[PDB]
């Protein structure tokens, strides 16, 4: 009744067991480039991301303007004082992210499916975000579901702690996951 695959080409995109993807479930624009929160004008000048609000800021537009991308921690002036991307939607709980556990073709109708293992944002755990959390941090739950591959939006990239900081230039779809979160026991375990 099912034919399982290690990998599947779906709509000219290769999906493989262990891949991480954005998902729009049945029961529930995608801009490449974000605006600077200061000038709102397109530019070749390098744009950095605030650790807190995740807004974009041209280096040359900061006060005082920066020449280089700051190494390590950085927040913008607004967080100092105290259309949406797919990542923005995920982190606001308006779409899902999952790791691909299985892929198969349903024999009865030829439809392709995955077994999704859901990620969860800290806000959606009953105890919520903690001070030590990062804004791009996800937990990998022990919740699973059968989802049609048609419901997959596109890949995201979920990094273990050892590889997260080195992915600082890898774009908007990069997330951190260190822990498995059991939703029933409300407990954490290292993926490591």
């Amino acid at each position: 009744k099912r034919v399982y695959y290690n990998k599947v080409e779906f709509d000219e995109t290769e999906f493989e067991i262990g891949d991480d993807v954005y998902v729009k479930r049945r029961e529930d624009e995608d801009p490449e480039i974000e605006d600077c929160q200061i000038c709102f004008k397109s530019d070749t000048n390098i744009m950095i991301e605030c650790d807190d609000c995740l807004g974009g800021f041209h280096l040359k537009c900061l006060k005082p303007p920066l020449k280089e991308v700051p190494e390590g921690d950085w927040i913008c002036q607004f967080c100092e004082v105290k259309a949406r991307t797919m990542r923005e939607k995920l982190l606001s709980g308006d779409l899902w992210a999952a790791r691909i556990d299985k892929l198969w073709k349903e024999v009865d109708d030829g439809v392709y499916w995955i077994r999704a293992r859901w990620y969860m944002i800290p806000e959606e755990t009953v105890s919520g975000r903690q001070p030590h959390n990062l804004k791009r941090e996800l937990y990998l739950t022990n919740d699973f579901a059968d989802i049609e591959m048609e419901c997959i939006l596109r890949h995201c990239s979920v990094k273990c702690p050892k590889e997260f900081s080195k992915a600082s230039n890898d774009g908007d779809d990069v997330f951190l996951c260190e822990y498995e979160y059991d939703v029933h026991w409300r407990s954490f375990k290292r993926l490591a």
Binding site: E32, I33, E34, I46, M47, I48, E49, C50, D51, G56, V69, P70, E71, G72, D73, W74, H155, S157, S168, N169, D170, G171, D172, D173, V174
Partner: peptide, 9 residues
């Protein structure tokens, strides 16, 4: 600090 992309991966 992370950078903002100029194009999708």
């Amino acid at each position: 600090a992370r950078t903002k992309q100029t194009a999708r991966k």
